[PDB]
Design an enzyme around this catalytic site. Structure first.
Site, PDB file in Angstrom:
ATOM      1  N   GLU A 172      22.092  81.500  24.633  1.00  0.00           N
ATOM      2  CA  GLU A 172      21.412  80.198  24.587  1.00  0.00           C
ATOM      3  C   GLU A 172      22.352  79.035  24.254  1.00  0.00           C
ATOM      4  OE1 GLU A 172      18.012  80.921  21.919  1.00  0.00           O
ATOM      5  OE2 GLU A 172      16.897  81.852  23.516  1.00  0.00           O
TER       6      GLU A 172
ATOM      7  N   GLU B 276      15.041  88.164  26.128  1.00  0.00           N
ATOM      8  CA  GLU B 276      14.135  87.863  25.015  1.00  0.00           C
ATOM      9  C   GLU B 276      12.812  87.381  25.582  1.00  0.00           C
ATOM     10  OE1 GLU B 276      15.565  84.954  22.034  1.00  0.00           O
ATOM     11  OE2 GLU B 276      17.450  85.958  21.731  1.00  0.00           O
TER      12      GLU B 276
END
Length: 445
Positions: free
Chosen positions: A170, A354
């Site tokens: 991320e 995720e």
């Protein structure tokens, strides 16, 4: 319960199911074995930056409880486990290897492979050593070269036990929440800082790629991006503009340099203060081929025109359900995001690295009846199936998280686990959702 059609591609051996964690969120033991301080140790100790008095000093104490946590991973029935490596543990300030820190990962990885698990390891999940932030952090170009050296050391030591390497988790969070909006560590807040930090992180990814491929030739190598689905607040053209700008600055800003070797070109006329300073040759390093793309997805957002900021984040005008952290539950938006990205780019294979929900979980009568999370997982797992049937090449799914943990600026107040953790006793208790996940996986014929 959680169910898929018995002829789904997801239920064959060509598809893997797992659970995921990150080092600073579960390990604790922040001063053991000469571990260096990280920018998140500093951020937690700064008044007002992290919820309440919460910090990472103990967390779930996984540094000491790792062996019983491997038995927990086994009990859930998963094929695979995704974790991150802590740069502060594995070397000193001069760059030399810290053997005690490396031993933690040696013993953990060997045991996971002896138990038959597939292993995904993330090299950078936000725990930058503070001494590198003292010289400018991700605003210092050298930090990318330091990351290459770190990736070189770790992959030489752990190459025999890792199936899939991701350079970064991320970059949007580490660069934009950390240096543009002031929400994450180290906590600066200007676009001139956030967008240069993003360029140096994508540079660091590219510099490490050839070193990882040399040191670990039997592995796959890639990067993990978070992407949520953006909508316009209404049919009006000014709200279509707001939506376009949100999606360009949150999502396109990161996938377009990786796939095409350029940043979004509309920014040159709409908002040139969001473009980084790029040296000759940098985009060739950033856009080298990767074996897979990890996608982290949770929710959608709605965007209204704003005269000062271009867009303003607003709530859905229709009645919808929200998780305990305030995020809309919208599995149909997951399928849309995947199909639209597939139509925009020639993508490598995707893994969902995720997906999960924060809930107001309580332990009652020895158990956790987390029915909201059961419904969340059922809906989003079927949304991935719908994307595969639409032609998107997706090869695995990882639920966030194995267990409740330190959720960054929310501290411990937001619980994402399939397993409940009592922080005072460290007792682990599988929730209803973990049992439903295990039932899905163990019934695969």
């Amino acid at each position: 319960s959680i169910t898929l059609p018995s002829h789904s591609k997801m239920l064959t051996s060509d598809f893997i199911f797992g659970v995921a964690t990150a080092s600073f969120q579960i390990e604790g033991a922040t001063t053991a074995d000469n571990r260096l301080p990280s920018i998140w140790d500093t951020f937690c100790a700064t008044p007002g930056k992290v919820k309440g008095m919460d910090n990472g000093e103990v967390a779930c104490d996984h540094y000491h409880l790792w062996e019983q946590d491997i038995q927990l991973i086994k009990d859930l029935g998963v094929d695979a486990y995704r974790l991150s490596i802590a740069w502060p543990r594995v070397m000193d300030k001069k760059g030399e290897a810290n053997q005690a820190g490396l031993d933690f990962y040696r013993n953990l990885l060997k045991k996971l492979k002896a138990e038959g698990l597939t292993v995904f390891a993330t090299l950078y999940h936000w725990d930058l050593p503070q001494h590198l932030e003292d010289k400018g952090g991700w605003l210092n170009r050298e930090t990318a070269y330091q990351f290459k050296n770190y990736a070189d050391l770790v992959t030489k030591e752990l190459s025999e036990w890792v199936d899939s390497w991701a350079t970064f988790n991320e970059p949007f969070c580490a660069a934009i929440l950390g240096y543009e909006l002031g929400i994450h560590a180290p906590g600066l807040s200007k676009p001139e800082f956030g967008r240069q930090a993003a360029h140096h992180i994508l540079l660091a990814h590219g510099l490490a790629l050839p070193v990882i491929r040399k040191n670990a030739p039997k592995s796959q190598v890639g990067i993990v991006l978070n992407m949520n689905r953006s909508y316009a607040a209404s049919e009006k053209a000014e709200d279509q503009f707001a939506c376009l700008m949100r999606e360009t600055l949150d999502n396109q800003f990161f996938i377009e340099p990786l796939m095409k070797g350029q940043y979004p070109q509309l920014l040159k006329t709409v908002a040139p203060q969001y473009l980084p300073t790029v040296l000759p040759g940098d985009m060739d390093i950033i856009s080298q081929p990767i074996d897979f793309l990890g996608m982290n997805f949770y929710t959608c957002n709605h965007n209204a025109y704003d005269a000062d900021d271009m867009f303003k984040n607003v709530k859905n005008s229709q009645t919808v359900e929200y998780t305990d952290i305030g995020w809309e539950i919208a599995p149909q938006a997951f399928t849309e995001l995947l199909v639209n990205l597939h139509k925009q780019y020639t993508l490598p294979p995707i893994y969902i690295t995720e997906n999960g929900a924060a809930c107001a979980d309580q332990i009652i009568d020895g158990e956790i009846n987390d029915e909201q999370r059961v419904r969340y997982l059922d809906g989003h797992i079927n949304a991935v199936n719908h994307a595969i049937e639409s032609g998107v090449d997706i090869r695995g799914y990882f639920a966030w998280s194995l267990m409740d943990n330190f959720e960054w600026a929310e501290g411990y107040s937001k619980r994402f686990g399939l397993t409940y953790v009592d922080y005072q006793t460290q007792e682990r208790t599988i929730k209803r959702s973990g049992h439903a996940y295990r039932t899905l996986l163990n019934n695969r014929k």
